[PDB]
Design a protein around this ligand. Structure first.
Ligand SMILES: *C/C=C(C)/C=C/C=C(C)/C=C/C1=C(C)CCCC1(C)C
Length: 137
């Protein structure tokens, strides 16, 4: 497929419930939901090597990985983790995460290109799934 592009969010569901699972207190959850409405993703894909830059109004981070190759990033609530991305189908990848220290909820994310030109990201903590939908800029 081709995930490359500059993606702009159009919809975000269940994000507050995800942060609650992760222990974020109420006022910060609401602030973070508002921040997620300016969530933007820039992707450069070459083969199965991905360069991804996620940003909001005041914060930006880049995530670089190769499918099937373990790497280090951070969970949504910011704890460092080791991650491994695999393909689930032609246009969908799934990442499993494992905390480097301590314990916590089981987290993961997915990215999918739809046939309608949308990018769908999900983030999971235990039973709760947040879904975010993007279109190309
Ligand atoms: C492939 C996409 C990945 C790895 C996306 C990771 C995104 C995050 C960890 C996003 C976190 C957010 C917050 C904790 C607050 C502000 C809004 C977000 C969505 C940028």
């Amino acid at each position: 497929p081709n995930f490359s592009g500059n993606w702009k969010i159009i919809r975000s569901e269940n994000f507050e419930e995800l942060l609650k699972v992760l222990g974020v207190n109420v006022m910060l959850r609401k602030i973070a939901v508002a921040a997620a409405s300016k969530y933007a993703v820039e992707i450069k894909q070459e083969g199965d090597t991905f360069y991804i830059k996620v940003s909001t109004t005041v914060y930006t981070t880049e995530i670089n990985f190769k499918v099937g190759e373990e790497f280090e990033e951070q969970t949504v609530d910011g704890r460092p983790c080791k991650s491994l991305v695999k393909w689930e189908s032609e246009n969908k990848m799934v990442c499993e995460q494992k905390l480097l220290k301590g314990e916590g909820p089981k987290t993961s994310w997915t990215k999918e290109l739809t046939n309608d030109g949308e990018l769908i990201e999900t983030m999971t903590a235990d039973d709760v799934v947040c879904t975010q939908v993007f279109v190309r800029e």
